[PDB]
C-alpha cells in the first residue's frame, strides 16, 4: 500500500538508544588486568557465523565482540596512550534512568590541553594522599583502589574561562560516595566513544535496515540481464576495460548488494568514478512545477586517506553515458587527517564558510546562518563522500534524505558493522569494491579476532557468491605478475598494455638484478643471517653499479613474515650501509607493508597447519608478491620452504621459467673462492 513505515523505520535506525551501551560500559573496571571486560563464561562468546538466522541471532553474536574490542581499546589507551590527567570540582547530581548526571567545573585551558570533548569516556579516581609534589599519570589510575568510568555528556563554556561539565556515571557505582559537593576528583581520558556508538547504533537498529536479509545471509543479489551494447557504450565513454564496464553496468542495473573484486592495480577507484558518473547520468535521465529532493549517491571508505583519494580524483569531473564531462556538486563530510587545500575546499565546513562570507565577523545570527547554509549545500549536493563511520554524522542524519545507493571503496579493510553503518538512510543498493586477498583489517583485541570479528562483510558474502572481477593490472612488470596470476586467479589476471616498457629498468640488464628472481640460499628459528647477508650484497651490487646514475630514494622495500627477522635485517643493513640508506630502504613485515609499494622489493622468507593458517599464508603471499613494480627478489631456503604448497609452487615455477638463482654470502664476488666453489659445486 502506502509505506510510511519507511519513515518509521528511518526514525528507528537514526534514533537508537545508547543508554543500554553505557549501562554495560559504565560498570566496567578501569583497573582490570584481563583480555575480557568481565568474568562471564567464555562460552558466552562465539564465532561470527557464515549465516545468521535473525537480527537477534546476529546481535547475540556481535554485541559481545563489539564490547570486547571496546574493552581492548580501553586497555590500550590505559597502558600506552599516556593521556594527561586533570582534576574537576564536583557540584550537584541528578538521577536519570540507571545513571547519575554529575555536574562539575573545570578550566577551559585544561579541557583544551587534555583534549576532552563531549564524545569522550573518562575515568575518575579518588586519590586523597596525592600531593602536587609528584606528576600524575594514568598509571596512578590503573593502580588506584577507587576508580569509576564516566561519560562526558555536556561541555558548556561559561564566563570566566571555565566549563560546566555534565558527566554520566552508573547509579550502582559505589564511587558516588566520593562525589560530595565541592570535592576535588582526579580524572583522565580513556577513549573517544564516537565509533563505538555508531557501530552500536547500526548493530541494534539492524532489524529495520532495508538490506537486513542480504546482510544476515551474506547473500548478494542475483545477476540481472544487461545489454551488451550498454556495456560497450560504457567501455568506450569511460575509457575502461571490459571487466570494469561489466561490473559498473551490472552492479548499477541491479538493486541489493554487489561485490566488485579488484586485485592490486586493477582500477577499483577508477571503476568507482565510472559508477558515480554512470549512476548520476542515468538517474538524471529518469501542471505547476513540483518540488523534489535531488538524487544523491553516498560514497564511503574505511579511512580518511581513501575518502580523500576519491575526492581528489572526483575534482576532475565525472562523465555521462555518452562520454561528456559534467561537474556534479561534491561534499566531503568530516574534516580529514592530512592538510590539503584541494580537499579542504570540498569539506562541508569550508563550503559553509564560503557560502556565508564575512557577514557575521550576532552569535545567534552566526549559528542560524551556518545551519541554513549547511542545509542548502547538502540539499543541492550530488555526491556525499565520507568514512564509513563519518556517514553516521548528524549533518547527514538531519538531511531528511534517503541515500538509496551507497558505494564502498576498500570494502575489505573494515569490520562488518562499520561497512553496514552508511545503509541507515534507506540504502537499497550497496556496491562494495575491495580486494579480499589481503590480510584482514587490524583489530586491537586478539580474542575478538580469534572469534572472526576482523572479517569484512565483503569476505563473508564472498563465501556465497562470485564477485565481478577486475582482471587487468596496471602496476607490475609481467614477470612479476605472472606467478600471482597463475597461482591465485587461474591465470586470468591480465597485464595492461606496455607493463614491460613501463617497468623496464637499467639494472635489469645485470644478472641477477632481474625483474623477477628467486634466490635459493645454499647454507626452529624465525631469523636467517644468510638471507640477510644475501640481501645486503644484492643491494650493495645495485648501488655500486647504478647510484651514480639513479637516485634510489624511496625505491626499495624489504619485507619478511617475521618481525624478528625484520629487526635483524634493519640492524644489519644499518651497520653495513650507515645512515645513507635511510631514505632508500623501507623495512617492514609483510603485514606492516600491506598498503605500500616500491619499485624494488626484497623478501626474506626465512622458513615455512590448519585452514585458518593456510588462509593467512595465502593472504600474506598475495600481499608480498604484489608489493614491487619493477623488480622482486625472493630470498629463501628451498628445503625450508617446500613444506608449503604455495612456496613449492613458487620455487618450481621460478625453475620452469629459468628465474631461480643459487646464492650465498659472496656469490656476487668473482674473487671469493669459497663462495664461488659453493656455487660451482651446484
Ligand atoms: N582501463 C584502464 N586503462 C588504463 N589504465 C587503467 C585502467 N584502469 C586502471 N588503470 C590504471 O591503474 C592504476 C590503478 O588505478 P586505481 O583506480 O587507483 O586502482 P585501485 O583503486 O584498484 O588501486 C592507475 O594508474 C590507473 O591509471
Ligand atoms: Mg583505489
Numbering used by the authors: 1096 to 1381, 1396 to 1470, 1543 to 1704, 1714 to 1798, 1802 to 1875
Article, verbatim:
Native single-wavelength anomalous dispersion (SAD) is an attractive experimental phasing technique as it exploits weak anomalous signals from intrinsic light scatterers (Z < 20). Here, the benefit of using a wavelength of 2.7 over 1.9 Å is demonstrated for native-SAD phasing on a 266 kDa multiprotein-ligand tubulin complex (T2R-TTL) and is applied in the structure determination of an 86 kDa helicase Sen1 protein at beamline BL-1A of the KEK Photon Factory, Japan. Both Sen1 and T2R-TTL can diffract to about 2.4 Å resolution, but only data up to 3 Å were collected and successfully used for phasing.
We applied native-SAD measurement using a wavelength of 2.7 Å on Sen1: an 85.7 kDa helicase protein with 32 S atoms, involved in the termination of non-coding transcription processes. The Sen1 crystal measured as 220 × 100 × 50 µm was carefully mounted on an elliptical loop with minimum surrounding solvent [Fig. 3(a)].
